[PDB]
Amino acid sequence: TKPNVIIILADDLGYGDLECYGTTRVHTPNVNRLASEGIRFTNVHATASTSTPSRYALLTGEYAWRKKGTGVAAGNAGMIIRPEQYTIADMFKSADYTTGAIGKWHLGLGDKTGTQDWNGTISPALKDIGFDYSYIMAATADRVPCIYIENGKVADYDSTAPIEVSYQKPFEGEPTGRKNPELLYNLKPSHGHDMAIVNGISRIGYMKGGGKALWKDENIADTITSHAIRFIEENKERPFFLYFATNDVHVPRFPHERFRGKNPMGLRGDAIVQFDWSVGEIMKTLDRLGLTENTLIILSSDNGPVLDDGYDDKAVELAGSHKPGGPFRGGKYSAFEAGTCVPAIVRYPAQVKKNQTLNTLLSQIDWIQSLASLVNVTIPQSKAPDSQNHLDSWLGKSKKDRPWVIEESNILALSVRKGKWKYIEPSNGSPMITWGPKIETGYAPYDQLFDMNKSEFESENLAPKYPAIVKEMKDILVQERAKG
């Protein structure tokens, strides 16, 4: 009846991190219930194995690798989605939906890198790309500034503690994680992550001031979840689109005390529990307001997982049997399947049958055109150019695979998934991530082709055996790049 649409997008949540995807080590009852009430997808792909390019593509319907700078965004990047670029929020606006973006961003603010006046109004910001309401973290949790932005101004701005940010130069007189580990009363770094100190945890980049506007990590989930509930409640009488992007499970993991210290995988496990709690809070509010039946929830993750992403939180020591990538090789940053094959759940009780498990090959690039079909919007010519309408497959009304899926690795090496085949194009990249995480990249100077029917773990390179399959996969990348 113009259904509401909520995208719940986790950060760095792996295929294997949720209980309903097979781990013995963490209880995720709210997400398990959500899946039981709809579809659990086993073959959904993000477009990229890193945060910024993945989110760029799902919000614009354009592969990030078409646009210079989407894969190397500065710590204080300007807007990566420019106001001239058509977004999923613009699409919903044109169906007379109220639009909101709450939580994690990864996509820049203001005009050019470093030009944000944190003591004033930021512009361009999310209202310039179609979001009526926004309450976002200014930066991901391991970066500065550690403040929230509400519609283009700093939330709870403190004029007694004016804000300054630099990714190039420290502020004289401010402590740093490297110089002053005695001030890290909550959490110490592993690799890098040893610059500004906020809330007893060091960060990437330098900052001064903030005062009352500075976040506390243990309250981030509560804060963003509360804002998501308020957006739903204020819009209970009209169609809305909410893009709810959690901080969890991004580093630093430092969850609320109702969770912290309770899961034996350590703070990383507690962050999965906290994610599940946030999902439960959304589900409870839809039930309280009688919105459950006519609300489409799409829950997924921007990219695959990482154990040690910069903090001394014992993630590797305490993982035990828990495989964040599920059956897949690699992780965040990688060209291997754990980089882009992510959890994905759809619940929409009016239209989607309960208790389904579907292996349909699908890509997040298709959300904008698929949801345009749902809400009867014709996207203008040339806009969302890589997005295809697969609404029937996303709602389990069809089992038709996407003809192929394109995956972008951190080095911009592209891969193709087509039926059972996975092709990785050659690159000069290192076989391991070099800066801290011990993640296999799948970078190699020769063609790689894997039969995912024979093993979900990409171990046996069949490229030399099947030149005709390699040529078809390479021809797909030529065709995709030629649309530029």
Cα gap 329→335, rounded to integer Å: 9
Question: What is the nearest approach in angstroms of Na ion to the Cβ of residue 80?
Answer: 5
- C-beta closer to Ca ion: residue 331 or 442: 331
Q: How many CA atoms lie within 13 A of 215 on its CB side?
A: 33
Residue 302 touches which of Ca ion, Na ion, none (CB < 5 to 8 A by kind)?
Ca ion
Q: Among the candidate windows 80-88, 224-232, 431-439, 474-482, which touches Na ion by CB under 5 A?
A: 80-88
Written as one string, the DSSP assignment of 223-249 is HHHHHHHHHHHHTTTS-EEEEEE--TT
- C-beta closer to Ca ion: residue 51 or 235: 51
Between residue 369 and residue 428, which ones bind Na ion under the rule CB under 5 A? none
Written as one string, the DSSP assignment of 448-462 is EEEETTT-SS-----
Question: Of these, 29, 83, 170, 181, which contacts Na ion (CB under 5 A)?
Answer: 83
- Give the C-alpha distances (Å, rounded to integers) separating 148 from 45, 89, 152, 174, 201: 29, 20, 10, 21, 17
DSSP E strand stretches across 304-420: 344-347, 356-358, 362-363, 405-408, 414-418
Question: What is the nearest approach in angstroms of Na ion to the Cβ of residue 185?
Answer: 37
Q: Which residue is nearest to Na ion (CB)?
A: 69
- C-beta closer to Na ion: residue 29 or 69: 69
Cα gap 275→282, rounded to integer Å: 11
Task: Confirm or deny that 309 is annotated as ligand binding.
Answer: no
Q: Among the candidate windows 74-82, 168-176, 256-264, 333-341, which touches Na ion by CB under 5 A?
A: 74-82
Cα gap 161→306, rounded to integer Å: 35
Position 11 contacts Ca ion (CB under 5 A): yes
Question: What is the nearest approach in angstroms of Na ion to the Cβ of residue 107?
Answer: 10
The DSSP bridge partners found for residue 471 are none
Question: Of these, 20, 33, 66, 69, which contacts Na ion (CB under 5 A)?
Answer: 69
Task: Confirm or deny that 302 is annotated as ligand binding.
Answer: yes
Estimate to the nearest angstrom the gap between the alpha carbon of 468 and the chain centroid: 35
Cα gap 110→102, rounded to integer Å: 17
Q: Among the candidate windows 12-20, 176-184, 267-275, 465-473, which touches Ca ion by CB under 5 A?
A: 12-20
Question: What is the nearest approach in angstroms of Na ion to the Cβ of residue 156?
Answer: 27
Question: What is the nearest approach in angstroms of Na ion to the Cβ of residue 198?
Answer: 27
Residue 303 touches which of Ca ion, Na ion, none (CB < 5 to 8 A by kind)?
Ca ion
- Where the chain is discontinuous (C–N > 2.5 Å), the residues before each break are none
Position 302 contacts Ca ion (CB under 5 A): yes
- CA proximity to 135, closest of 36, 231, 4, 3: 231
Question: What is the nearest approach in angstroms of Ca ion to the Cβ of residue 396?
Answer: 26
Task: Confirm or deny that 12 is annotated as ligand binding.
Answer: yes
Position 303 contacts Ca ion (CB under 5 A): yes
Question: What is the nearest approach in angstroms of Ca ion to the Cβ of residue 275?
Answer: 13
Q: Which residue is nearest to Ca ion (CB)?
A: 51
Cα gap 52→310, rounded to integer Å: 18
Position 70 contacts Na ion (CB under 5 A): yes
DSSP, res 21: G
Cα angle at 305 between 302 and 309, to 5 degrees?
110
Task: Confirm or deny that 11 is annotated as ligand binding.
Answer: yes
H helices present in 326-445, as ranges: 367-375, 391-394
- Residue whose pair of structure tokens reads 């506390």 in the numeric block: 216
DSSP, res 83: T
Question: What is the nearest approach in angstroms of Ca ion to the Cβ of residue 252?
Answer: 14
Residues 312, 266 contacting (CB under 8 angstroms):
no
Question: What is the nearest approach in angstroms of Na ion to the Cβ of residue 108?
Answer: 8
Residues 416, 407 contacting (CB under 8 angstroms):
yes
Q: Among the candidate windows 51-59, 220-228, 349-357, 455-463, which touches Ca ion by CB under 5 A?
A: 51-59
Position 12 contacts Ca ion (CB under 5 A): yes
Question: Of these, 30, 43, 51, 360, which contacts Ca ion (CB under 5 A)?
Answer: 51
- CA proximity to 47, closest of 415, 411, 392, 391: 415
Q: How many CB atoms lie within 10 A of CB 176?
A: 17
Position 408 contacts Ca ion (CB under 5 A): no
Total residues binding Na ion (CB under 5 A)? 4
Residue 70 touches which of Ca ion, Na ion, none (CB < 5 to 8 A by kind)?
Na ion
Residue 52 touches which of Na ion, Ca ion, none (CB < 5 to 8 A by kind)?
none
Catalog residues that contact Ca ion under the rule CB under 5 A. Answer: 11-12, 51, 302-303
Q: List contacts with Na ion (CB under 5 A).
A: 69-70, 80, 83
Binding-site residue ranges for Ca(2+)? 11-12, 51, 302
